[PDB]
Amino acid sequence: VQLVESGGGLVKEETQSGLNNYARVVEKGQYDSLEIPAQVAASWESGRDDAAVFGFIDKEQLDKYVANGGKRSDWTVKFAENRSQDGTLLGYSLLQESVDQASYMYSDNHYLAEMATILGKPEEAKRYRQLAQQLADYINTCMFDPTTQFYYDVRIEDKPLANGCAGKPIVERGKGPEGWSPLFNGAATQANADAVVKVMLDPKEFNTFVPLGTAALTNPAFGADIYWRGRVWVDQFWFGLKGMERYGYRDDALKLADTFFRHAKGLTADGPIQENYNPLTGAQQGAPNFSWSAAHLYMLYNDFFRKQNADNYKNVINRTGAPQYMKDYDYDDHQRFNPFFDLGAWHGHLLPDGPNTMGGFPGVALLTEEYINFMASNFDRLTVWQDGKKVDFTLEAYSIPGALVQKLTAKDVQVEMTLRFATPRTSLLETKITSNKPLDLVWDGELLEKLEAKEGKPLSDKTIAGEYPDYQRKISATRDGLKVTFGKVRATWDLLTSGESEYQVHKSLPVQTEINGNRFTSKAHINGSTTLYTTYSHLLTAQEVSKEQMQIRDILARPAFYLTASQQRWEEYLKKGLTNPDATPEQTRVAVKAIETLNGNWRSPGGAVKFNTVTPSVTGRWFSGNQTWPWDTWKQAFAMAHFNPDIAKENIRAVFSWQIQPGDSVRPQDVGFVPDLIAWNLSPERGGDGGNWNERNTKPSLAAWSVMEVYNVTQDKTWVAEMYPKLVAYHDWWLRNRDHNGNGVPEYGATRDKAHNTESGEMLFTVKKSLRLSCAASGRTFSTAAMGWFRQAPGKERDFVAGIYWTVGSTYYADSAKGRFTISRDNAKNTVYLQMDSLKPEDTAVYYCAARRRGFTLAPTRANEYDYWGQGTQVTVSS
Ligand SMILES: [Ca+2]
């Protein structure tokens, strides 16, 4: 007896259009078979990818939810188009008003009124106070649930409730951090706040090992490892504490801060700052050198941590390493080393790991427009020779805020190396050699060969050069050092170069330099103690290569000036930043890690971005170059206000510099909109070749809060005057384009976009193609008896799908197959079929045919009741 399955594999997709067609599919019962690009983008606009509140819940969680009394349809989020009175297409909204977004809008209004007051505009202040009070009434009437004493999003139902609310609170999707958003933002009444704080401090809800995670323990879609449905983020934790303090519970906030300090793993160690924590174990996850984590850790230092010159802070972050791959990635594709970047520069350096890399600063990290890529292991590494024997050194190497230092000590030679940044394109190394005898010096370097590793293991046998033939890396000796030139590479997702970018080495000492393919050696002879100065410059355009030469000449002429400028700027960061007298040494050191992190993620202007900016992570797979987000920015600038206010202001400016103005070429219906993602390269719709520039959605709005924080530390009236109209245009944009029911209470949404609609304005959506599986039986005919389909997901039981039985060919289906799957038989062919329509990712599994010859009383539906099995066939359905 043999059963042979056929017809599996990756299921294909088909694009459809039309909001009317979409509604007909929802009506049919088949919501779960749809992917709508605009709705995916609205989840990006919320800033919480797969939060429970937006309908995201996995199969096993949903089964349990139903077993507890709930319906699967309780997780469906409907979607609508937003049109003006003219009929113009404005965008799209979730049919759901979010309490965190209502509270942000409350804050927007509150801070805008303060700004109008500062600016002597009392009637505008009156408008903004009125809008705030209206929003607070809606939030406290509509979004607060008296039974569960907490806040939730509401649906936009077919008609409003008797009291005017768009719909009932979505209590059944469970509690999340959005519940304390009214407290943080100050919209909550005192009674409602008291109720919320009690839930926050409940050990059954949020008061976990690391408290205030992204879903309460009681949330049906909670998982301790899910980014947005259980894990703890520093922003929402801090919002939580601030909200508590706002309504009289500073004492308890202080207790939670202490808990967090004791339990968040690695806080007092030397690893990079990451994204989030498991609420049960405190284990860390996410991109290293993560800006908004640094920002909120700094704000916690400032507000909540307490006891219960750059030399004082060595090795706060481990910056050692010896990369062997251009993309030497961790498990989540982030660079697994922590290079030192300063001054907004576009290249960075590591400390030598041991004597193998000693005498150099290994792993030149290059920021190639939008990505971080390692160029070399050793590059310009010094070795010292006497009579043809290499001098043996002891290594000591450390980082401090603003510098890398290495000291090499031998019996009769000492070398002291100090690396600091000099301009936003140039770093400067001082190499001080002490010797009473002549020496031969040798510098060596090698460009990397291997492309990609993940967790130290090569992903393939691919080479940099094989993968990117346009890169054309070439080392040349120069007048006063060496350069590496690069070809034009437009690898949208990986590596971006102009064709005119260069990495230049200039030295104060004359050296003779030999190139041997991807290697170089430079030699010089010295007759005793010598100090030399070396500049390293990553230059991204012909104009930059040109402009930097004069600067490079200046740095080599005035090295003491530039080294001192760096040391003193960093003394100012620590002096302004370390303002908590009641902090322990360990807490203070956490603040210094945050300062180093944020200043590392600062980029100088580049390509389309005309201002200094700060990105979520210089080492991040998708967060590097000068890629800038609004949401990350507001948080970054709130904290950078307190230690580097000039870059705080720049960061906010960079984001507003691409705000939509009347007469815009792409989206004139979006005046006041702030794009989700700006970067070096403009989108093709704007005449560039960039793939990251994103205007399909914005992010939640903490812009007024962030601008006001810069005012609270500077009291600069010209700053408020500058920002206030940009803030007003953005505020107004939400009310034109993200308010489907026009009640003045925003929804998360998406813009009209090439990704979202056809030229004529018909909303795009995607459905999977039908897939048919077949099972050819060999040996005994089963048309009298039983044939069935089972499935099993990775590490799960074999679960019944559908069966066909007896002469008459009666059928039976799993509830999850009903409506979608159709089993059938060709008795002549001894073959059974399964037609699978309305597939969804939950259906990914190995599918097995099975058969039973022996008589049965009732149609067999359980694995152990079948007697023959095919080998299985994988079907994959991806989102
Ligand atoms: Ca609304």
Side-chain angles (χ1 to χ4, degrees):
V1 172
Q2 216 174 11
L3 312 169
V4 182
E5 311 110 1
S6 287
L10 196 76
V11 193
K12 297 156 144 71
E13 290 187 357
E14 198 210 322
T15 293
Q16 309 256 53
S17 58
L19 179 89
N20 296 322
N21 295 329
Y22 145 85
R24 285 166 211 152
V25 173
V26 168
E27 194 156 42
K28 205 126 74 59
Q30 296 315 330
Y31 169 83
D32 298 306
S33 72
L34 298 162
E35 297 172 0
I36 304 175
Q39 194 171 345
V40 174
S43 80
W44 296 343
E45 196 160 281
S46 80
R48 296 189 283 127
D49 266 326
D50 67 341
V53 66
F54 307 115
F56 291 99
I57 185 161
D58 70 38
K59 171 144 50 64
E60 310 69 35
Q61 291 171 330
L62 188 47
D63 288 344
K64 289 191 169 73
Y65 171 68
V66 165
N68 230 14
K71 304 282 166 173
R72 299 187 161 84
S73 72
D74 299 343
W75 298 83
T76 301
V77 177
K78 302 165 223 126
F79 203 67
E81 71 193 11
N82 290 345
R83 287 196 186 265
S84 73
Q85 256 163 52
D86 309 314
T88 312
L89 177 62
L90 300 181
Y92 297 96
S93 282
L94 305 170
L95 286 169
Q96 179 165 319
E97 289 168 349
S98 307
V99 58
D100 68 323
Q101 198 196 11
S103 308
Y104 296 141
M105 201 65 53
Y106 175 95
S107 154
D108 192 31
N109 278 129
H110 167 88
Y111 289 118
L112 279 172
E114 295 190 339
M115 294 186 199
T117 293
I118 285 155
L119 301 164
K121 290 168 176 166
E123 296 308 299
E124 295 169 61
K126 187 180 196 176
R127 155 167 185 91
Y128 296 123
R129 305 219 165 108
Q130 189 55 235
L131 295 186
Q133 191 54 60
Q134 292 177 7
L135 277 158
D137 295 351
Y138 202 89
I139 292 166
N140 286 297
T141 300
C142 307
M143 293 160 165
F144 186 77
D145 179 55
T147 307
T148 66
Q149 304 276 196
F150 210 69
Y151 292 100
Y152 310 81
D153 287 22
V154 295
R155 303 171 175 88
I156 297 172
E157 296 162 13
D158 277 291
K159 72 194 175 207
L161 310 179
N163 65 5
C165 299
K168 302 202 316 205
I170 308 164
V171 314
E172 64 268 15
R173 289 182 201 154
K175 303 173 173 89
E178 69 273 13
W180 59 75
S181 190
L183 285 70
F184 166 73
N185 288 298
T189 48
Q190 184 65 52
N192 287 349
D194 296 319
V196 159
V197 165
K198 192 58 228 81
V199 178
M200 293 173 66
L201 295 168
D202 192 339
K204 331 252 183 303
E205 309 280 13
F206 296 100
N207 202 351
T208 43
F209 188 70
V210 178
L212 316 186
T214 52
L217 293 182
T218 59
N219 193 296
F222 169 83
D225 279 321
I226 312 169
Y227 267 44
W228 294 105
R229 308 206 302 276
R231 300 196 103 149
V232 183
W233 299 63
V234 206
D235 64 332
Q236 298 285 348
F237 178 84
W238 180 86
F239 295 147
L241 271 40
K242 287 302 278 172
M244 287 171 68
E245 185 192 54
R246 194 168 199 151
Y247 294 91
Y249 299 89
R250 182 153 171 86
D251 280 351
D252 285 292
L254 284 162
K255 287 142 91 175
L256 294 188
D258 174 42
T259 295
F260 179 102
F261 201 86
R262 286 189 286 98
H263 291 159
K265 290 297 147 272
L267 200 62
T268 66
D270 69 1
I273 292 168
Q274 286 177 261
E275 292 182 76
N276 55 46
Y277 304 88
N278 176 323
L280 303 188
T281 63
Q284 301 198 79
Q285 264 264 56
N289 311 302
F290 189 67
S291 290
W292 94 48
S293 291
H296 290 274
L297 283 167
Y298 177 79
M299 283 328 291
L300 281 164
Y301 162 79
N302 192 65
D303 302 334
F304 295 110
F305 292 156
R306 37 139 100 155
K307 71 246 206 134
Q308 300 292 300
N309 187 257
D311 306 315
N312 295 347
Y313 310 101
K314 293 171 165 62
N315 302 310
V316 175
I317 288 150
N318 179 358
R319 305 205 185 260
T320 71
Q324 288 312 305
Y325 304 78
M326 188 180 73
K327 292 165 173 275
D328 213 329
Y329 289 165
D330 62 27
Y331 173 71
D332 285 316
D333 303 315
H334 304 305
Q335 295 276 19
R336 66 183 184 99
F337 298 111
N338 307 304
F340 172 51
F341 296 85
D342 189 27
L343 272 184
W346 288 73
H347 70 285
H349 300 285
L350 299 159
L351 283 171
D353 45 50
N356 288 329
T357 42
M358 160 168 102
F361 292 90
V364 175
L366 300 181
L367 306 176
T368 63
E369 291 173 23
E370 293 168 33
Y371 307 97
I372 174 180
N373 287 297
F374 287 117
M375 186 196 81
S377 53
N378 301 305
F379 203 75
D380 202 38
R381 171 191 39 187
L382 172 69
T383 59
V384 184
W385 301 69
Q386 24 177 30
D387 306 297
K389 185 224 197 334
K390 181 165 78 173
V391 169
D392 290 301
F393 293 113
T394 298
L395 166 73
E396 194 202 355
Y398 61 88
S399 54
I400 55 165
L404 303 184
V405 178
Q406 76 177 285
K407 296 159 203 305
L408 317 182
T409 305
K411 198 196 176 101
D412 50 10
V413 185
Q414 294 73 234
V415 184
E416 177 185 300
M417 290 183 261
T418 298
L419 187 157
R420 285 170 174 285
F421 276 80
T423 75
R425 286 310 182 279
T426 296
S427 57
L428 168 60
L429 169 75
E430 175 179 69
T431 300
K432 174 149 34 204
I433 304 177
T434 300
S435 184
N436 305 338
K437 306 191 86 49
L439 303 165
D440 293 304
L441 316 170
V442 177
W443 297 261
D444 72 281
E446 192 186 30
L447 295 188
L448 295 167
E449 300 292 270
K450 298 187 292 180
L451 177 67
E452 190 163 3
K454 168 166 282 206
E455 287 290 311
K457 324 172 211 263
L459 258 196
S460 58
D461 269 308
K462 291 185 168 192
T463 64
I464 293 155
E467 192 68 349
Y468 307 96
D470 292 347
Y471 208 11
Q472 300 166 272
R473 291 166 308 157
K474 188 202 163 81
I475 315 168
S476 297
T478 64
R479 298 198 293 239
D480 60 342
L482 62 137
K483 59 192 250 214
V484 192
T485 58
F486 303 100
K488 194 187 184 195
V489 182
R490 294 325 286 171
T492 319
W493 312 108
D494 296 284
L495 172 66
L496 292 170
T497 76
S498 63
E500 303 148 347
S501 72
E502 290 180 26
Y503 191 68
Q504 312 184 347
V505 186
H506 300 249
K507 297 195 167 172
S508 71
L509 188 86
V511 301
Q512 309 76 244
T513 297
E514 169 81 297
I515 311 314
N516 181 252
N518 281 324
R519 292 169 176 204
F520 85 84
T521 299
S522 299
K523 294 186 195 161
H525 174 91
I526 60 167
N527 289 311
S529 296
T530 315
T531 295
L532 67 129
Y533 290 97
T534 305
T535 58
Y536 305 115
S537 303
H538 179 212
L539 310 155
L540 282 83
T541 78
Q543 199 73 287
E544 293 185 15
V545 167
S546 185
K547 277 194 159 152
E548 206 66 13
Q549 299 312 301
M550 196 172 288
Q551 300 313 300
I552 289 164
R553 297 274 151 183
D554 195 46
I555 297 154
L556 291 179
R558 279 150 16 106
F561 160 66
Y562 283 94
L563 300 170
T564 303
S566 163
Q567 308 179 16
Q568 298 242 44
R569 179 169 33 96
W570 281 91
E571 300 175 14
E572 189 59 11
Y573 296 143
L574 300 164
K575 179 71 200 181
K576 273 191 168 85
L578 308 173
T579 41
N580 180 1
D582 301 338
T584 72
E586 321 174 295
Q587 289 162 348
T588 298
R589 198 174 170 95
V590 175
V592 170
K593 194 180 303 191
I595 293 165
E596 287 196 31
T597 307
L598 293 162
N599 284 343
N601 293 341
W602 157 32
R603 303 272 79 75
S604 53
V609 183
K610 286 309 180 277
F611 294 89
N612 294 274
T613 198
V614 182
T615 86
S617 175
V618 68
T619 48
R621 182 64 176 91
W622 300 112
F623 297 149
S624 197
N626 59 347
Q627 303 197 68
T628 309
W629 286 258
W631 190 227
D632 300 65
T633 294
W634 318 132
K635 301 166 201 177
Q636 288 156 7
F638 190 96
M640 294 183 74
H642 290 269
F643 68 89
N644 193 355
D646 185 58
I647 303 310
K649 287 183 283 164
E650 282 286 281
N651 198 5
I652 294 179
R653 286 190 187 113
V655 175
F656 284 104
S657 86
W658 285 96
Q659 174 176 53
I660 304 303
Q661 307 296 338
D664 185 268
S665 56
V666 166
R667 49 185 73 259
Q669 74 284 0
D670 276 318
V671 177
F673 166 83
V674 180
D676 182 42
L677 206 170
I678 69 174
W680 193 286
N681 295 280
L682 290 164
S683 74
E685 309 99 84
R686 295 190 186 292
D689 70 357
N692 295 307
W693 193 284
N694 178 30
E695 295 175 7
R696 304 169 44 178
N697 54 279
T698 189
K699 279 279 186 279
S701 189
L702 277 176
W705 170 85
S706 195
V707 164
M708 189 72 72
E709 195 61 6
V710 167
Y711 178 81
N712 288 330
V713 299
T714 67
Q715 225 176 271
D716 173 354
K717 290 213 194 318
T718 65
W719 167 250
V720 168
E722 174 188 12
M723 285 323 308
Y724 173 83
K726 298 173 188 300
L727 295 169
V728 173
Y730 194 24
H731 169 272
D732 283 4
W733 169 85
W734 287 98
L735 296 176
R736 276 180 345 275
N737 290 27
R738 294 287 191 280
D739 189 19
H740 180 82
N741 56 352
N743 66 344
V745 180
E747 306 94 37
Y748 290 129
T751 66
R752 166 182 185 143
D753 194 89
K754 61 152 201 224
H756 295 164
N757 40 280
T758 65
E759 182 172 324
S760 33
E762 306 287 24
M763 181 183 83
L764 302 167
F765 65 96
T766 300
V767 289
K768 305 299 179 188
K769 297 302 268 187
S770 308
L771 194 62
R772 186 176 80 168
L773 306 179
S774 82
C775 173
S778 205
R780 303 179 182 270
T781 158
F782 298 87
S783 149
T784 271
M787 296 206 81
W789 288 99
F790 294 74
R791 64 176 171 211
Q792 60 159 354
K796 298 260 90 174
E797 62 261 54
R798 271 170 212 202
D799 274 318
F800 179 78
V801 177
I804 192 161
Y805 313 93
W806 294 294
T807 311
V808 80
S810 192
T811 56
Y812 200 89
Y813 294 90
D815 283 17
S816 64
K818 299 209 195 186
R820 325 153 63 205
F821 299 175
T822 321
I823 196 169
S824 67
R825 220 163 55 179
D826 190 304
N827 312 290
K829 261 230 282 190
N830 208 21
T831 54
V832 56
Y833 304 105
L834 187 66
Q835 183 177 320
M836 306 169 86
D837 307 326
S838 308
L839 285 161
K840 61 207 169 196
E842 300 83 79
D843 299 308
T844 294
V846 189
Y847 284 78
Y848 295 95
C849 71
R852 162 179 187 136
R853 84 100 192 166
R854 67 205 210 293
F856 43 87
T857 301
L858 302 162
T861 68
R862 285 173 291 263
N864 294 141
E865 319 184 284
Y866 285 79
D867 301 322
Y868 312 115
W869 293 89
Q871 65 167 339
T873 293
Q874 176 66 55
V875 333
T876 312
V877 188
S878 60
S879 41

